[PDB]
Amino acid sequence: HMTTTDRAGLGRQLQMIRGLHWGYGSNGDPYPMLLCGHDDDPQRRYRSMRESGVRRSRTETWVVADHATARQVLDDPAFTRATGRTPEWMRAAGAPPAEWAQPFRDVHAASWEGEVPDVGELAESFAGLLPGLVGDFAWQVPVQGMTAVVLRGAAWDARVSLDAQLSPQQLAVTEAAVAALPPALRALFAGAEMTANTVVDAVLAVSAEPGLAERIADDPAQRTVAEVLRLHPALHLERRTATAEVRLGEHVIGEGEEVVVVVAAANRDPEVFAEPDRLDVDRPDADRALSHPGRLEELVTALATAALRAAAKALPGPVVRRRRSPVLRGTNRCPVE
Amino acid sequence: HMTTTDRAGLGRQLQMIRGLHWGYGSNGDPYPMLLCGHDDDPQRRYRSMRESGVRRSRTETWVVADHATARQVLDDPAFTRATGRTPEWMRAAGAPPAEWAQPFRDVHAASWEGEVPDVGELAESFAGLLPGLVGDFAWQVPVQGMTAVVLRGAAWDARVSLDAQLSPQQLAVTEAAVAALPPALRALFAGAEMTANTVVDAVLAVSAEPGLAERIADDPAQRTVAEVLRLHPALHLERRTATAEVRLGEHVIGEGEEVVVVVAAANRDPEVFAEPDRLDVDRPDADRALSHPGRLEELVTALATAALRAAAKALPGPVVRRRRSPVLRGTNRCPVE
Amino acid sequence: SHMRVVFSSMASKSHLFGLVPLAWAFRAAGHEVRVVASPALTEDITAAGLTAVPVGTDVDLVDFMTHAGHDIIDYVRSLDFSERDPATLTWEHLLGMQTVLTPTFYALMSPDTLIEGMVSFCRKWRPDLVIWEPLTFAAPIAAAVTGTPHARLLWGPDITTRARQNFLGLLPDQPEEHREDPLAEWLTWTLEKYGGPAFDEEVVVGQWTIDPAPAAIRLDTGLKTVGMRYVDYNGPSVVPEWLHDEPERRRVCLTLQVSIEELLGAVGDVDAEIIATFDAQQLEGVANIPDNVRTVGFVPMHALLPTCAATVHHGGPGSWHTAAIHGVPQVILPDGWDTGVRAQRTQEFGAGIALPVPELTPDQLRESVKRVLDDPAHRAGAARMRDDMLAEPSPAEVVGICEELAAG
Amino acid sequence: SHMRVVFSSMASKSHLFGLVPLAWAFRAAGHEVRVVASPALTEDITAAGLTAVPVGTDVDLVDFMTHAGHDIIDYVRSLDFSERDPATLTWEHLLGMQTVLTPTFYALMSPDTLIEGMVSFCRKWRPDLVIWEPLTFAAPIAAAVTGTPHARLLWGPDITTRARQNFLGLLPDQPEEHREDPLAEWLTWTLEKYGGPAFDEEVVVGQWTIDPAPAAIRLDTGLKTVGMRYVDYNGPSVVPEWLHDEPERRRVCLTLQVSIEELLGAVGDVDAEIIATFDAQQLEGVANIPDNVRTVGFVPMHALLPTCAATVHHGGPGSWHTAAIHGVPQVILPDGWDTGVRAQRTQEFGAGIALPVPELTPDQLRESVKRVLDDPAHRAGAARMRDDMLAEPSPAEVVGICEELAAG
């Protein structure tokens, strides 16, 4: 529910930011071209972002992809997931983030401080699902799992929320999320989509590797889920904002100045990980950066771990991916058996 | 001789002054309406001018018609026939008198200080002219007379000069005068037309009166010529200009400020002359104002006196008069026998 | 076929405007159109979206008017033709107009400079046709010298033509020596300056005349007339947001006496919404006059008049013609020779009321506004005038009639 | 039969001008014509002698441009269609244009305020036809909502239409989820705001399109085209006294690089009188460049081009179209996407030379000016274009074609 007048105003705002993101991006700056997510392969932009280390974009934002500085800021407490400051280009464009982004940035900020059942007792319910995956199995896993600790369609409409906070979605897509967006439950909806693509990417990675395929059936592993969230994290980008001025490699980061941690880039540094862009289940390199308070990451890793173990029996069409997801990189169609 | 360009400029000037004279005149002021001479009878305007005494017009000019003040200024030496000052309306109109009026005002200024033969020896030549009048007799009298002390057609073209000094004539009429205008000879041309209308008005007045008709034949008189130049003077208006400031009845007349003596009005004051607008040959009233140096008036009175005496034998159509002559009031057609 | 058309007006914003829609008519037809006038009229030409050809130099009216001309403004307000008195038709009176208006107005405009300026442009640009405002005698002279076809484009009545036809009509009664013709004398000695043809009344009136006025309110002159459907132009027009809506109650619009402008209270006693064209400056003294009255300043008449049941105005061509084409009954408050004559013609036809401003009374206005609103006759009269005008060709169609006439 | 025509342009002096002669064409035909636009364009409407209906409020570009928009000026100068490279026809590239230009330009103009402003006026004034500048999407929306017939009036090439037709042409290759259409999404959710009809490509292109460009240099779009004989309008035009005379020697006029404007010496080595449209301010540094060169500032092109053997210009519509109709060979110095495309089309036809400004050399200009003056082919090419254009109806005739089309 919302008037066709404010709808019109919102649509105009979402379209202006994306328009400026693409313009800035096509002109040179790689962070807004990534933010548009017009490509399915972001790995060359991540190399360029890591190569630079730290660079602030055309928008005010500081882009941290060097694993050394990425860990440095994620560990620093000044950098938080709160409402920062409005950059001049945005208010001048007539699209304050406080308007086009607002529900979605409160979702990113939400913390799920609840008991996380990692029992694997979940994998018991999850067994009878694949008969003798995006919506028929992967999205089925968080719903039935959180039910045995949040409606299917409701969570599916809100699934774009953690992209919408940095990247403007379509008007109907933005509209459907706000209407289906509920604190903890809000944060649980977010984790549901985090878990959902983890299941897809894992089954996709297992499908290619010769070992992982028949090996997962031998011991139903947490190691595959760990490695998958390195090459394909829950959140590729991590929006943070400084409360007090911070010094990161000779750079002064002001109060309310936004910093975005490029986790997917960081998690493939040639100096930190051996064969980074290669799927290695048995790798000593466990210095991977992720996610800030709460245990939502711990919740998804459990839902995905239980899921991978249940589908260990079945493990031995064209894959379409969501095109406006620079943060979480979701799949929409994953065929078949 | 003169270019069609300066001709165009002159025509425009003559037409502007007359345009403003008529406008000012129709609006109220009687002096410029008189100056246009659209009427053949000026006697009501002269009553109004005398009634006032002295009044300055819409143009700068002082209008003196009261016989008392008329004589007062004609006798005063400060008031002269020289080039005065240009009034603001004229230069603003774009017609300085120094341009549209110039030859003609030098004619008015001219003095004929030459021996005036009043012998009446002239009336001997003038005898054989009328067989058993404007051009066939009246204009014939000054030519043959001045020849026995100046060509016929030449004097006829210049005949408008003493009107042109106050009243703008037509462009061709102004053009023809300048080309036929020659000092003394210049002043003699002027006297020729002065004499010419005197002959016409006299024969016209004699024609109506019962006495004067057969009486002029008895003693060929100077008394008729005297009385005629009272009711019909050589110059009805008399352009003068102050050299030094003069006080006339409570009025300050500035240097170069024009004064026009309305001689024809003055010469019919009810307080000065008995039955003024009536032709009386035997009248004691000889206090009539006229004409300033020279003897031109004395010359014309002689040419006209000789003329009236010669035509004493013949004395016992529609009369057309020149329409732009407020100064001298000339006749163009005087039929017949 | 493609033409080079020259439009000439004297340097008056009040006069150029009557030529504007026909100039644009020609250019939309694909013809080359240039408005040849004095440097003063340039801003007004360009503000009409037209190309200006400023020729010659300006004339100092300010100096002429302060010292000489002002009295001629007092002289003109005297003349009155709307009643046809025998006193005004005397030779003395008529030659009077001819003697004063020829130098002080017709020739005051059309100066030395403009005429040589136009003659130079025409000789060079080689126009195919010259359309001129009825009192800009430089244009027919230029057109005579160049041998270019020329036509007059009227706005209000052709009062000068009627006054002249009468003046010439008396010339034969007067003796050969008492004859005079200032306008002919001027134009003749002007035509000689450029070596041009002999004088013809064709230089005073055109070769033809275009009049946007309905046939019945036109004066009888006998001149080749091309009637034209009127299309308003009155300078920069901006529609206010309030004039978008269809009116609620019936509307009377008042546009600009001896009534101390306190006359607003008189039209206020009328049962209608009044729209007064007065600014907040013009009505700084009025304190009790408004009630049903609306003051909105200068607004587009071609946008306001289509919404009025009646109209009260000075009698100006723009107001007259615009109201006339919209079948809007009129209450004219004349002050000029040109306005009175027309105000009288339109009252005779029954398209309104003529209220001379010297004789004007607030009782007369209240009654007159009440009369046009209530008597269905004034509307019916105004309906006939409108119908006459819509039956005449549009400036678009008049382009072809000129094109053809220009050839022969 | 009488019509109510609305003309709408975005608040750009550079865009309104292309509608001006056709607006005047309609009003000369006797129709009611109103130019509905934002308050900024009001002075320019009134300076075209047209009636302005300013609706809504102004848009603060100064603030938007200083902080956000400037980069989009840098983005636009990159795009180049004149060569048809396969790289520019990729889905990624084309959706790019659609994603950036839709909000930052089309919708930046046409704001919230203007669209409701036009929809309000149209609902009230009840127009019979809406003629609009090709990138003022408020007008077709207003016309869609009101159900009023509407048509586009082009000036330069229809490059946006060609770019869009290609973009839509690739939409089917992309998966259902990867599909997007910013301009359709915007216009669709806009049509919903006024409850208007469903989205139709008819809101993007018109119901028909009027193009003053010769048939051969028009892009293939398939859209209902009404060709029109071009009649120039370029704001306030004043003819200088020097432009009255027929030229002595042959004339080349230069109108506005990386050549430090010292290029005047290059055109000076040409055997011809050069007329440079530069002011004394613009040429304050040039000390040896003039010899056969004349600097006269901004002058009317529709008065200068009829006297030129050749022309050197930026490629702007006014310069292109005016030279084209006069059969004047052209040396275009393009810098825009719109100018390059057209400069390439006119060179292919042989009506001139296209010299891109990034690649531009003073040797190229001297040779190019020498080439158009001496090779009778460029004149012959320019002669065909001229002949094509004079065979199209005048804006006067186009009024009837619209009138008829508006009915059905």
Domains and CATH numbers, chain B: 1-337 (1.10.630.10)
- Rounded CA-CA distance B13/C189 in Å is 13
Judged by CB atoms closer than 8 Å, whether chains meet at D107 and A12 is answered as yes
Which of left, alpha, beta for B234 (phi over 0: left; psi -120 to 50: alpha)?
Answer: alpha
Judged by CB atoms closer than 8 Å, whether chains meet at B20 and C178 is answered as no
| Chain C interface disruption, residue of B20, B31, B169, most C CBs within 10 A | B20
Q: Output A121-127 pairs: Cβ under 8 A, ≥24 positions apart.
A: A122/A148, A122/A302, A122/A303, A122/A306, A123/A220, A123/A305, A123/A306, A123/A307, A123/A309, A123/A310, A126/A306, A126/A307, A126/A310, A126/A311, A127/A310
Select from A4, A27, A92 the Cβ nearest to the Cβ of D192.
A4
Query: Could you give phi then psi for residue A238, rounded to 5 degrees?
Result: -135, 100
Query: Packing angle between helix A4-27 and helix D112-125, nearest 10 degrees?
Result: 130
- Rounded CA-CA distance D207/D405 in Å is 9
Longest dimension (CA), chain C: 68
Q: Do chains D and B touch (3 or more CB pairs under 8 A)?
A: no
- Rounded CA-CA distance D395/D218 in Å is 18
- From the CA of D334, how many Å to the nearest CA of chain C? 28
Query: Which residues from chain C sit within 8 angstroms of residue B320, using beta carbons?
Result: 175, 177-178
Q: In this structure, are C259 and C293 located in the same domain?
A: yes
Judged by CB atoms closer than 8 Å, whether chains meet at B20 and C74 is answered as no
Distance, CA of A260 to chain centre: 12
DSSP D257-305: --STTTTHHHHHTSSSEEEE---TTTTSS-SS--SSEEE--S--HHHHG
In DSSP terms, A259 is beta-bridged to A62, A240
- Rounded CA-CA distance C312/C350 in Å is 15
End-to-end CA, chain A: 39
Tokens of D11: 């608040």
Query: Which residues from chain B sit within 8 angstroms of residue C190, using beta carbons?
Result: 8
Q: Are D155 and D128 in contact (CB under 8 A)?
A: no
Query: Could you give phi then psi for residue D251, rounded to 5 degrees?
Result: -120, 140
> Number of Cβ pairs closer than 8 Å across C and D?
113
Question: How many domains are contained in chain C?
Answer: 2
Q: In this structure, are C253 and C378 located in the same domain?
A: yes
Technique used: X-ray
Tokens of A218: 């031998």
Helix (H, G, I), strand (E, B) or coil at A214: helix
For chain A, where are the E strands, in sequence order?
54-56, 62-64, 79-80, 237-242, 246-247, 252-253, 258-262, 320-321, 331-333
For D191-242, where are the E strands, in sequence order?
209-211, 225-227
Torsion sign over Cα D163, D166, D171, D173 = negative
Pairing of strands D273-276, D209-211: unpaired
Tokens of B129: 């002219």
Q: In this structure, are C215 and C313 located in the same domain?
A: no
Select from D64, D100, D193 the Cβ nearest to the Cβ of A92.
D64
**In chain A, which residue's Cα lies nearest the Cα of D188?**
A8
Judged by CB atoms closer than 8 Å, whether chains meet at D51 and C244 is answered as no
Judged by CB atoms closer than 8 Å, whether chains meet at B22 and C100 is answered as yes
Residue A282, CA distances (Å) to A210, A271, A286 in order: 14, 18, 10
Q: In this structure, are C276 and C202 located in the same domain?
A: no
Q: In this structure, are D219 and D253 located in the same domain?
A: no
**In chain C, which residue's Cα lies nearest the Cα of D236?**
C46
Q: Which residues of C touch D (CB under 8 A)?
A: 20-22, 24-25, 27-30, 34, 42, 46-55, 120-121, 124-125, 229, 231, 233, 235-239, 241, 244-246, 300, 302-303, 394-396, 399
> Where in the sequence is the domain holding C210, given as residue range(s)?
1-231+393-408
- Rounded CA-CA distance A72/A54 in Å is 12
Q: Are C217 and C342 in contact (CB under 8 A)?
A: yes
- Residue of A5, B8, A134 lying closest to C185 (CA atoms): B8
Tokens of B64: 């003196």
The DSSP H or E segment spanning B238 is strand B237-242
Between CA A234 and CA A244, with CA A238 as vertex, the angle to 5 degrees is: 150
Q: In this structure, are D311 and D209 located in the same domain?
A: no
Q: Do chains A and B touch (3 or more CB pairs under 8 A)?
A: no
- Rounded CA-CA distance B88/B92 in Å is 6
- Rounded CA-CA distance D182/A18 in Å is 10
- Residue of D47, D297, D238 lying closest to C54 (CA atoms): D238
Select from A16, A27, A318 the Cβ nearest to the Cβ of D103.
A16
Q: Are C393 and C218 in contact (CB under 8 A)?
A: no
- Rounded CA-CA distance A329/A35 in Å is 11
Q: Are A57 and A63 in contact (CB under 8 A)?
A: yes
Select from C68, C92, C186 the Cβ nearest to the Cβ of B20.
C68
Q: Are A134 and A320 in contact (CB under 8 A)?
A: no
Distance, CA of C243 to chain centre: 27
Q: Are D156 and D320 in contact (CB under 8 A)?
A: yes
- Rounded CA-CA distance D218/D236 in Å is 29
Q: In this structure, are D216 and D122 located in the same domain?
A: yes
> Number of Cβ pairs closer than 8 Å across A and D?
94
- Rounded CA-CA distance B318/B322 in Å is 13
| Chain C interface disruption, residue of D2, D8, D27, D34, most C CBs within 10 A | D27
- From the CA of C217, how many Å to the nearest CA of chain B? 31
- Rounded CA-CA distance B43/A259 in Å is 109
Q: Which residues of C276-305 are buried (b: 16+ CB within 10 A; e: fewer)?
A: bbbeeeebeebeebeeebebbeebbbbbbb
Eight-class DSSP state of B298? H
Query: Which residues from chain D sit within 8 angstroms of residue C52, using beta carbons?
Result: 237-239
Q: Are A94 and A13 in contact (CB under 8 A)?
A: yes
Tokens of B278: 């009536």
- Rounded CA-CA distance D347/D327 in Å is 14
Q: In this structure, are D207 and D121 located in the same domain?
A: yes
The DSSP H or E segment spanning C313 is strand C310-313
- From the CA of C49, how many Å to the nearest CA of chain D? 4
Neighbouring residues of B50: CB distance < 8 A, sequence distance ≥ 6: B65, B66, B67, B262, B265, B266, B268, B269
Does D349 reach chain A within 8 Å, measured CB to CB?
no
Q: In this structure, are D197 and D265 located in the same domain?
A: no
Amino acid at A281: V
Neighbouring residues of D143: CB distance < 8 A, sequence distance ≥ 6: D122, D130, D132, D149, D150
Q: In this structure, are D237 and D375 located in the same domain?
A: yes
Query: Which residues from chain B sit within 8 angstroms of residue C100, using beta carbons?
Result: 19-20, 22-23, 26
Residue C284, CA distances (Å) to B56, C261, C295 in order: 42, 11, 11
Q: Is D290 exposed, middle or buried (0-12, 13-18, 19+ CB in 10 A)?
A: middle
Tokens of C65: 């008017």
Query: Which residues from chain A sit within 8 angstroms of residue D185, using beta carbons?
Result: 11, 15, 170-171
Neighbouring residues of C193: CB distance < 8 A, sequence distance ≥ 6: B4, B5, B7, B8, C115
- From the CA of B10, how many Å to the nearest CA of chain C? 11
Neighbouring residues of A77: CB distance < 8 A, sequence distance ≥ 6: none
Helix (H, G, I), strand (E, B) or coil at B335: coil
- Residue of A176, A172, A322, A27 lying closest to D184 (CA atoms): A172
Q: What is the 3-state composition of chain C as percent helix, strand, coil, each rounded to the nearest 5? A: 45, 15, 40
Judged by CB atoms closer than 8 Å, whether chains meet at C50 and D49 is answered as yes
Neighbouring residues of D388: CB distance < 8 A, sequence distance ≥ 6: D214, D215, D216
Residue corresponding to tokens 């007159």 = C368
Neighbouring residues of C343: CB distance < 8 A, sequence distance ≥ 6: C82, C315, C332, C334, C354, C355, C356
- Please state, as a whole number, how many other Cβ atoms lie within 10 Å of the Cβ of residue B23: 27
Q: In this structure, are D165 and D241 located in the same domain?
A: no
- Rounded CA-CA distance C40/C171 in Å is 38
- Rounded CA-CA distance A164/A142 in Å is 21
Please, where are the H alpha helices in chain B?
A: 4-27, 30-36, 43-52, 67-75, 88-93, 97-100, 102-109, 122-125, 140-147, 152-158, 161-164, 171-180, 184-208, 210-218, 222-231, 263-266, 296-310
Judged by CB atoms closer than 8 Å, whether chains meet at A38 and D95 is answered as yes
**In chain A, which residue's Cα lies nearest the Cα of D182?**
A15
Tokens of D201: 């490509």
Select from C29, C49, C52 the Cβ nearest to the Cβ of D239.
C52
Judged by CB atoms closer than 8 Å, whether chains meet at C48 and D52 is answered as no
Q: In this structure, are D269 and D302 located in the same domain?
A: yes
Select from C21, C27, C303 the Cβ nearest to the Cβ of D51.
C303
Eight-class DSSP state of C394? P
Q: Which residues of B touch C (CB under 8 A)?
A: 4-5, 7-9, 11-12, 15-16, 18-20, 22-24, 26-27, 36, 38-39, 58, 88-90, 92-94, 170-171, 318, 320, 322-323, 332-333
Looking at chain C, after which residues does the C atom sit over 2.5 Å from the next written N, breaking the chain? 256
Neighbouring residues of A303: CB distance < 8 A, sequence distance ≥ 6: A122, A141, A142, A145, A146, A191, A195
- Rounded CA-CA distance A212/A81 in Å is 36
**In chain C, which residue's Cα lies nearest the Cα of B16?**
C103
Q: Do chains D and C touch (3 or more CB pairs under 8 A)?
A: yes
Tokens of D243: 């432009």
- Residue of C408, C348, C352, C349 lying closest to C379 (CA atoms): C352
Judged by CB atoms closer than 8 Å, whether chains meet at D238 and C29 is answered as no
Query: Packing angle between helix B4-27 and helix C91-101, nearest 10 degrees?
Result: 130
- Rounded CA-CA distance D140/D206 in Å is 7
Helix (H, G, I), strand (E, B) or coil at C279: coil
Judged by CB atoms closer than 8 Å, whether chains meet at A27 and D75 is answered as yes
Pairing of strands B246-247, C225-227: unpaired
Query: Which residues from chain A sit within 8 angstroms of residue D67, using beta carbons?
Result: 88-89, 92-93
Query: Which residues from chain B sit within 8 angstroms of residue C193, using beta carbons?
Result: 4-5, 7-8
The DSSP H or E segment spanning C211 is strand C209-211
CATH no. for residue D252? Answer: 3.40.50.2000
- Rounded CA-CA distance C367/C381 in Å is 18
Distance, CA of D180 to chain centre: 28
- From the CA of A83, how many Å to the nearest CA of chain D? 22
Neighbouring residues of C114: CB distance < 8 A, sequence distance ≥ 6: C37, C38, C55, C56, C138
